[PDB]
Amino acid sequence: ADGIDSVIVVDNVPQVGPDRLEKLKNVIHKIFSKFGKITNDFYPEEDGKTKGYIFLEYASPAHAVDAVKNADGYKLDKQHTFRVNLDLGNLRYWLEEAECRDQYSVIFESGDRTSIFWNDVKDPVSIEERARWTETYVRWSPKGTYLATFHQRGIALWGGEKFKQIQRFSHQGVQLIDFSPCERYLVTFSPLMDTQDDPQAIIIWDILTGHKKRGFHCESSAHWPFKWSHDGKFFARMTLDTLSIYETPSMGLLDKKSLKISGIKDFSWSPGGNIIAFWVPEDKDIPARVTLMQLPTRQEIRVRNLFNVVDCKLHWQKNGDYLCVKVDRTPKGTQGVVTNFEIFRMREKQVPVDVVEMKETIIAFAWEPNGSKFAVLHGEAPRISVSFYHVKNNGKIELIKMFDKQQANTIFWSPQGQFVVLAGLRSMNGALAFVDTSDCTVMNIAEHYMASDVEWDPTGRYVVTSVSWWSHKVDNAYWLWTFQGRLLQKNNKDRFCQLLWRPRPPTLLSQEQIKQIKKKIFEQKDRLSQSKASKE
């Protein structure tokens, strides 16, 4: 009588055969799954048929009495009443280190180099390879936290500046990732799905735990990167009709129409805010309505309306000030083929909306991080012309400089201010140019024959144009763009795909330190100390 002693008696069990016993027990398990689970199941047999009595053993008293009181009194098939009776010292190096030059990400020859390539002196340090844990890339989270594997071998955490092994997360058959800015979460996405008992092709595990914070299934994928916000207090996670929220980490869905929307195309998290914007496909009379909202107040304060629009893609200012919507709309009313931007002003009072038109459509867009300028590039691949706009805080915006017979369509935005790098490097050639500020000029051209992509450093130190192996031929080089015409890189390492900044912490800077740099006058020592190091 010792041990479990948890044998029960569930009356009004139906008599069935042995071949239909699996389907009948699954319906009996689904009925018992309201308050419990099945770990031991037995049924008596009378001449091959069931006797009419079965048992569900739990091996504790507590929920076996509660499931007995929740299953009795109900007439089962139509008529029969069932009756149941029974580390921090090592890792975060890159803020307070000696040099403060922006590191990069290195991959060449698909596993023959997995490294960091330095902002170098052509010295031996850093001499790097990190062995055989990753096939596809050395891949980072936005706090610099990771050197990772995108592979079936898993999703990997490795910390330090010197590639120490921290943590290995469970993924078989993985296709993708999603990375947090605030170093709170990570995701993996799998192209081979798991079984329906815990149905998942989005398996997402926290950065702290190495175990799943939320997990759910995925049947379709529109584009690359269910992402994390600047602070990560609220997130957006749907499956394939919806927009609704998953909370950090509890997957809390709210009952709001404001945080949970029906049937929209595109959404974001704001660069400065806790704020979500979207656009809705139009009804017959009712407009296409982009909404500016707040999450925890559960209300729509700000609704833009524009009649006779077809589609919209969103671009926020990278400090969260302005939101420009580029349309592929031409009016059905007028013949004229013209596009418009609705520019909101979120930080200014009562959200003004201004319009600025063009005679042509746009192929790109750029919003300036921390600047009172704006760069807008419109036109086809032979006719891609960029216009540098200067938008004040109070007033309207205008156009300063338009260039005929230009192809500069790739814009790498620096964190330093007052400088833009403009490349024509998409898939016919590379043509680079620097767009400086106060005054706007076209002053320089750096030659690149191999490069495909242009992105800049989180300090303001380098905007790099580099090459890809499986998208173009072997013409290979690495030529990054410095502002002064000086050479920023010389490297050819075979089958290299990218080189981009491994990021740094939140700086939490002040205006007083920039005011001292707002004063040769005191900055005289740094060239002379370099001259003693360059002596022979």
Binding site: A62, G460, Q513, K525, D526, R527
Partner: peptide, 27 residues
């Protein structure tokens, strides 16, 4: 030059597993 001047759980998991084991034994 202005830039260069600027330059320079185990107990909780065990308690969760014990709570999961107690819930599964009840169920």
């Amino acid at each position: 030059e202005k830039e260069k001047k600027e330059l320079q759980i185990p107990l909780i998991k065990s308690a969760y597993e014990e709570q999961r084991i107690k819930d599964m034994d009840l169920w």
